[PDB]
Structure formats: C-alpha cells, structure tokens
C-alpha cells in the first residue's frame, strides 16, 4: 500500500493521540493558574480539536506557559497532519493524471 496513504493514516492516528494528550496536559498545566478556564477534560478536548484545526474560537485558550507550549504542539500537529493529507491527495492526483496520458 502506497506511502502517501500510509503517512496520511499515521498522521491521523497521531493527531488523535496528540489531541488526547494535549487535552490532558493542558488541564494539568492550566489548573493552579487563577482565572484559567482550560481546566476540565471535556472542554479541553474541544479546545485542542479547535486548536488542531486552527479554528480557535477564543471561548477557551491556555494562559500558562506550559499550556501554551502544549497549544503550539497541538497547532503544529494539526497543521502538519492536515497538510500531509493534502500532500497525499496531490500524489494521488499527480500519479493518476500520468495514467490518463499513458505512463
């Protein structure tokens, strides 16, 4: 089975792991900081997802250094993962256009 498709898959399992860990680490880092709202697992998960997809509505965000550090990792993972899929879709289109022409 083609590499680009393996990577895409990996990227997804990975992203999910990061989202989950991201949620846990965020709450762990944010609790103890007065005024912090990223302090319960369920919403933290919703937070990381909206962060990984880079949407970030602003209803939730870390205020501590480690929380933000966890945010960066999640942002980057989401961006890389989704970009890696786009890349897989390209290799797919490129590889098949070569077919519709012969090679």
């Amino acid at each position, epitope marked *: 089975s083609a590499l680009h498709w393996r990577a895409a898959g990996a990227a997804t399992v990975l992203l999910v792991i990061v989202l989950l860990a991201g949620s846990y680490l965020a*709450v762990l880092a*944010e609790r103890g900081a*007065p005024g912090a709202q990223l302090i319960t697992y369920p919403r933290a998960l919703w937070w990381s997802v909206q962060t990984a997809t880079t949407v970030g509505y602003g209803d939730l965000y870390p205020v501590t250094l480690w929380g933000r550090c966890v945010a960066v990792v999640v942002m980057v993972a989401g961006i890389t993962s989704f970009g890696l899929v786009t890349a897989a879709l390209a290799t797919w289109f490129v590889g098949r256009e070569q077919e519709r022409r012969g090679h």
Partner: antibody
Amino acid sequence: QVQLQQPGAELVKPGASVKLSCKASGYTFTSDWIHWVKQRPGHGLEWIGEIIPSYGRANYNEKIQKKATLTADKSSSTAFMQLSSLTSEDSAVYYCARERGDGYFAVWGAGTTVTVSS
Amino acid sequence: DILLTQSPAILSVSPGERVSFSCRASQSIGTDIHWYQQRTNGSPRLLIKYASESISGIPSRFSGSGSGTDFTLSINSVESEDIANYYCQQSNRWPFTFGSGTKLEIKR
C-alpha cells in the same frame, strides 16, 4: 461501597502537625483529582487544594495561609494532606472528595474531625 | 477569584410548598455551577451538576436552572428530609469556589 475513607478524628497540639489520609476505592481513572475542603464548625465549605494522583501535581488555595501539603501514593490509592504548625484556627472538619476532571465533587469522604488543643 | 453569593441565608417555608435558593456568580460562568446538600453532621452530597443536570439517586423533587451569573436550585414540594444547608460551587475558572450556604428551614 464507601469510596473515600478518612480517619474519624485527629488531636493535635498547637504548633504540631498531623497528616490526614483519604483512601479511595471503586473506579479510579488517570483523570482523577482528589480535593480537600475545610469546614469550620458552623461555617461553610472552604477549598484547600487539589492533587492529581496519576501525575502527582497539586495546587492550593492562594486566598489563605498555606498550611497543607498534598501528596498521593499511587499503589495504595491513598491521598494524603500534611497540615503543619496548626492552631485553634486550624481546628475543623476536613473532607476529601473525588472530582473526575469534570468540575464537580462526585463523592465526599465522611471527613476527619481535627481538634487542635493541649 | 469568582464569588458565589447565596442570599437569603435562611429560607423558611411550609411543608409541601415549592422553594428556591439563589446563587449569584460575580461573573459569567456559563452553566459550570453545581449544587450540594449537607444535613446536620453529614458530608456534602451532590444534588445537581452543571446547573441543571440531575444526578442519580436524587429525588426527582430537586431541579436546577440558570446560566451566566444567576442560578437557582428548586425543590418542588419540600419535606422534613430536605432540612439542611445548600451550597453552590463553580468550576468555570480556577480555583473552584463555594457559596456561603443557605439553610432550609421548615415551618410546621
């Protein structure tokens, strides 16, 4: 079955320091936080601090004098609170509760009555 | 830190009547409010979580409502077993905080 067990009482001499216990049983998750609440006779509930066993970190209430030190023993499923140099002011009922990381205290221990006298 | 105001402090009501305790947050906390009951010498007992969600084992008699800064815990048809102290607690922002408490008192 009784999820949080705490010693009925503890006598402490002014200046001394007792270490309260709270052992849990039932479903225990990696997202669990054990809290400690202090209730002076006749008054209300005062949040003291929290700890996440699966990781060992603890946070405390800043509005008050920190007289507690939270710890947790993974294997025995027991959370501990070290109150030091107590005084009459520290005498009260100390409860421990379990919070599933979703913000509310599902279950509380029966609480430990702590009396600080000579 | 978020302040939870519970007034009146004491509530007097006749048996079977409907009753409501109020809890006001110093700032908007969504529905991250929870209610606890504590009878004479017992430990707190979770009544309502997240402002309106019910807990199992709690008389269908107890309901919650509110959002933002104003929350209400109602008891449709009060009865002797309801005589206790009621507290509210928020998990919107760290640290969790508690209300001053409201004592339910029945007039028989």
